[PDB]
Amino acid sequence: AIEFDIQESKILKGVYIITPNKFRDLRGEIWTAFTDEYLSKLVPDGIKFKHDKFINSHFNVLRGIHGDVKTYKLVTCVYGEVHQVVVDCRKDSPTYLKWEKFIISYKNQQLILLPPNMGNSHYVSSKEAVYYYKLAYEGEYMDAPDQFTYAWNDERIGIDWPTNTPILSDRDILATK
Amino acid sequence: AMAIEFDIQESKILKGVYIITPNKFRDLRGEIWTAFTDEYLSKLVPDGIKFKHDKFINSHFNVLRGIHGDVKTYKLVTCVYGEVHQVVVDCRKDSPTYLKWEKFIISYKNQQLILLPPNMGNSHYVSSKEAVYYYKLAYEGEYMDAPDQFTYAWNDERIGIDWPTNTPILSDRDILAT
Ligand SMILES: Nc1nc2c(ncn2[C@@H]2O[C@H](COP(=O)(O)OP(=O)(O)O)[C@@H](O)[C@H]2O)c(=O)[nH]1
Ligand SMILES: Nc1nc2c(ncn2[C@@H]2O[C@H](COP(=O)(O)OP(=O)(O)O)[C@@H](O)[C@H]2O)c(=O)[nH]1
Structure with a gap:
């Protein structure tokens, strides 16, 4: 019953597009x-998806560009x-510093896997959006001070x-200066 | 950096059911x-059983789903x-x-995750225009699909x-149980 199509990006090695049924x-x-059975093999052995987060944002909010040295997303x-x-x-x-866009609509489910040292960003084109992400990493969570930031523009x-x-x-404004 | 926090309260009326409130x-x-983090919340289920399955249900106003359960799945x-x-x-x-119930009216204004042990009936009714229902499943072995689950009538x-x-x-399915 439960299935996942898994394609590697044609632009950025190590980035995968996961499409559930x-x-x-x-x-x-x-x-x-997500299941551990089908998707844990996207990250190397010993590193577990162990952290679930949500970002509720309004129209025209942009968050990014954020990353860290050890977290898969x-x-x-x-x-x-x-x-x-x-x-x-x-x-x-x-x-290095190339990018790829996915327009992700809740009507068409697409999960993107980012390895560490990748910049994560999104822009809200609907009135409201809910952004779901799972984090895989060893040890402590990397909060804002332990992350890098590139300017959105x-x-x-x-x-x-x-x-x-x-x-x-x-934070995201500070990176423009 | 605002630290990740969870308040965890046991239901005052159904033993084994917990109300988790994040900041x-x-x-x-x-x-x-x-x-969820594994560090703070894996202790809600007994050792050897892991949360290993994430699901979403997008539903419209006035949809009711339930009452569903099985012998081995924590939710x-x-x-x-x-x-x-x-x-x-x-x-x-x-x-x-047995056969008592507890209601939680859940939205972002009262962000609230409910832990159900096995042999519990899960149900919800959508009171907003659209809703997104998120749930994590913890169980050993194979997923229990619809044929391996029980169903009580919503009413x-x-x-x-x-x-x-x-x-x-x-x-x-939920009509058949009437
Ligand atoms: N692909 C997929 N299908 C699911 C999932 N959860 C439930 N379904 C399907 O939804 C269908 C309807 O579920 P339900 O009405 O509760 O049970 P049924 O009518 O007795 O099969 C079933 O065929 C399930 O396999 C899921 O996570 N992924
Ligand atoms: N309570 C809580 N706070 C979080 C979470 N994730 C991030 N934060 C906090 O959200 C705040 C805002 O992030 P952002 O504006 O991107 O970075 P900042 O401007 O440097 O704080 C930071 O203080 C983070 O610590 C979470 O899951 N829970």
Whole structure:
């Protein structure tokens, strides 16, 4: 019954697009976002998905670009719509500072796996959105002080966003200067 | 850095059922919160049993789902968008509260995750326009799909659940139980 299509990105090595199946009828939809059996093999042995988070954001909010040295992230949108943008922040990568966009609609389920040293960002194109992500890492959670931040509009990255005037946290503003 | 926190209270009326309340960082952009960590919450289920399965149910207004359960699955349930009337039923025949129930009205204003042990009846009713229902499942071995689950009628008079309507939208499984 439960299934996952798993494709590697054609642009960024190590980034995977996971597409679950669902039971859909007129009443709504039911689906499995993760099982340990099918998806734990996306991260190397000894590192476990052990942390689930949600971000409720309003229209025109942009969060990013955030990353750290050890955390794998499995991300999606379970209500509304986001422009999810993954940035290659691995300095030893031949695609360093290239990016890939997924427009993730809660009607079309797509989970994106980001390895460590990748930049995570998203922009809310719907009225509200709910962003779900699982984190896999060893040891303590890497909070804001232990993360790096690239500016949402860094010209070296050149991300194509739907606006020039998003709503940004003070952290995400600070990175523009 | 606002630290990740969980308040954990046992239900005053159904032994073995826990109400988990996370903290949140709220600002003008919206909200960020942690629904689960292994470090804080794995101790809600006995040793050897792991939360290993995450599911979502997107439903419309007036949809009722339930009452579903099985012999071995622990469930950690909440609503991450909209509002549900979450109702837990004690389906443990040894229990002195067998077929009693407890309601939690769950939304982002009262962000609340409910832990159900095995042999408990899980149900919810969607009181908002749309809702997203998130739940984690902990169990050993294979997933228990619909044929290996029990079903009590949403309106079973022996249970006597107070729902906001007499005319919910029901799956054919949940109708069959009438
Ligand atoms: N792909 C997928 N299908 C699911 C999931 N959960 C439930 N279903 C399907 O939803 C269908 C309807 O569920 P339900 O009405 O409770 O039981 P049934 O009518 O007796 O099968 C079943 O065929 C399940 O296999 C899931 O996580 N993923
Ligand atoms: N309570 C809680 N706070 C969190 C969580 N995740 C992040 N935060 C906090 O949210 C705040 C805002 O993050 P952000 O604006 O991106 O970074 P900041 O501006 O440097 O604080 C920080 O203080 C984090 O510690 C969580 O799961 N729960």
